[PDB]
With several copies, the nearest count.
Chain A
Amino acid sequence: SALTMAEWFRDEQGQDVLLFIDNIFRFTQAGSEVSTLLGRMPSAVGYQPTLADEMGELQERITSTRGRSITSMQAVYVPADDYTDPAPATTFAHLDATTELSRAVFSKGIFPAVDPLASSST
């Protein structure tokens, strides 16, 4: 819904959209909560078999076209501080700059708790 509002602002009005998304991971989690009820065999870590493709159908709309800009910014929950979990591991491939916060840096009192050795930018 919010992405559709942003897409209208980008395609029809055409002026410098900003799009914040607090915990885009909840999208994947909600998709996994109904997956077996829909009758799908679960994949590796209990996620829906269609994890990457649903995430790609949603994330590829959060984009800027030629001449039309959408500065997108998403918070991504990492389950149990595990960056190898399939949901953040799949979200990683959709981003130009990823600021990765760490609980080892949070425990030291350093804020923002950014892990400088894992965070990246293109």
Chain B
Amino acid sequence: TIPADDIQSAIEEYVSSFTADTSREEVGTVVDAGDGIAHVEGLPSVMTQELLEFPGGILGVALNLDEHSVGAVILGDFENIEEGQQVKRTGEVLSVPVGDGFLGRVVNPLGQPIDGRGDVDSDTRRALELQAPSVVHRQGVKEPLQTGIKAIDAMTPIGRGQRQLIIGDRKTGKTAVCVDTILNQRQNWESGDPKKQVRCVYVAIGQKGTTIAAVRRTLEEGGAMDYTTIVAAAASESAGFKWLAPYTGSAIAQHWMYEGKHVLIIFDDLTKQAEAYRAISLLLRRPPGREAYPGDVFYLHSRLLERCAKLSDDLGGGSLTGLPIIETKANDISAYIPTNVISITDGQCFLETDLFNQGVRPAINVGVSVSRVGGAAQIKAMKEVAGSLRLDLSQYRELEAFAAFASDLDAASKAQLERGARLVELLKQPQSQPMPVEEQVVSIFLGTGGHLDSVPVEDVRRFETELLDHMRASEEEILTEIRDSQKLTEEAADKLTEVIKNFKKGFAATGGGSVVP
């Protein structure tokens, strides 16, 4: 049944206590309006970036201030703005509600729930433009943030407090990479340990509504909506919403970071935020630069991405990890916004369509991808079994021209060729199937210890799959002590090698042949 008189008496509570005495306000008047911008005469005391209240609950942001008017960006329902309306002052700069009630919700770039599950109980408010942690308020990035993706977690590791750019053409698998990074924190959330839990914020800027719905469905089917918020600025929202969405998503998750918690934040298509800000700045008639960008667009992105930090111990030790996504055009990483965000971040993951079509998925170009934090963002086991991996793949990539002449190659050259083919087949990974770090350690152990030289290249994946399956069922102790001690000591390696040999003599290739040395 439904709480009936609970309803009616809740609203009687609201009205009986309705007190709104006659305060003196400072008003202005709309003098012109067009394309989402309104100029307001009056308001002598309005400050920059202040929220303004138009008739009908419409909100604007005072961006341009000069001797005649105030140029404000209408934050939605712009078609109700008329010349002659009265604009009231708020006295507050843009702020958003913050708290734990935001986990599992989908909100505006204003803290307003758009999923329809009721209001969000808010702990506190937080301004959008609060400064980033000082240069002395920080700490070296030392803990790993596991993405569950072998290519990333082995070749371009991500730490807690690091800015890792995910940059690619389109339909290359960037959203999939970030959604799997989100899903991989499910087991860390189940542990109930506040030093291991990672809260996630997924900012969706300028996307189709059904695309955000599909991302939320994928995060629900993986049980990842107990620790994930979505700040959605759909493609139908105003340019102000798309410009403000990542600042809303970063104001949330800074409350957490300063409360001593660890957060991951995904800015999906910062390019669309840059284009929304370019629209705003061109409608306000600000000087355009290269590609018509205002001239503070680098500041627009660097002010946002420097709030991702690893705090010191006297600030709680919390952290905010950033995963900004950039969509290039024809692999032109030399464009303007790609150049800016590559300059800003701590490492890049270049996804390519040519690798995606060749079956290399995730299509991460491990030759040009980089992580400037590096081995400091890895556990001992992964730092050991994957330090061999980079130049293995380098040798393979510089040898694959001789793929048709392996008879003419030296012994070591053909060895490197076969090992490289095996390792390339090793880093392939299905979608929405992230692996814990112990299974990644075991798989890359298969790769670099040489236990794949007996398996056909068209059988590696399945082999690895089945082996991990076996190890999850029979020998869970290896994975368990890898997880607990973060290192693969020599005795665990002995037991692992014997397990691999037994599974080999049990495994059957697809050509019918053997996989035993």
Interface on A for B, CB 8 Å cutoff? 26, 29, 32-46, 49-53, 55-57, 59-60, 63, 77, 79-80, 83-84, 89, 92-96, 107, 117-118, 120, 122
Contacts and interface: CB of A to CB of B under 8 A. Distances in A.
Q: What interface size band does chain B fall in?
A: 35 or more
B329 A40 contact: no
B287 A36 contact: yes
B298 A29 contact: yes
B235 A120 contact: no
Given A36-B289, A42-B289, A49 B235 contact: no
B290 interface: yes
Contacts of A50: 35-36, 239, 279, 283
B278 A43 contact: yes
Contacts of A57: 236
Interface in B260-278: 269, 272, 275-276, 278
Interface of B: 34-36, 170-171, 206-211, 214, 234-239, 242, 269, 272, 275-276, 278-279, 282-283, 285-292, 294-296, 298-299, 329-330, 332, 334, 339, 343, 353, 357, 391
Tell me the interface secondary structure of chain A in the complex. Answer: loop
Nearest to B391: A107
A37 B208 contact: no
A52 B329 contact: no
A34 B234 contact: no
A34 B282 CA distance: 16
B235 A43 contact: no
Nearest to B214: A122
A45 B357 contact: no
A9 to B, nearest CB: 19
Contacts of A46: 289-290
B284 to A, nearest CB: 9
A37 B296 contact: yes
Nearest to B269: A93
A60 B209 contact: yes
B243 to A, nearest CB: 11
11 contacts: A34-B295, A41-B283, A42-B292, A43-B282, A49-B278, A49-B282, A89-B329, A93-B235, A93-B269, A96-B210, A118-B353
Contacts of B242: 53
Contacts of B36: 50, 53
Contacts of A56: 206, 234-237
Contacts of A55: 235
Instruction: Please name the 8 residue pairs, one residue from A and one from B, whose CB atoms are nearest each other, closest first.
Output: A56-B235, A36-B295, A46-B290, A60-B236, A49-B282, A36-B289, A80-B334, A84-B329
Contacts of A45: 290
Contacts of B329: 83-84, 89
A41 B235 contact: no
A37 B295 contact: yes
A48 B282 CA distance: 9
A52 B235 contact: yes
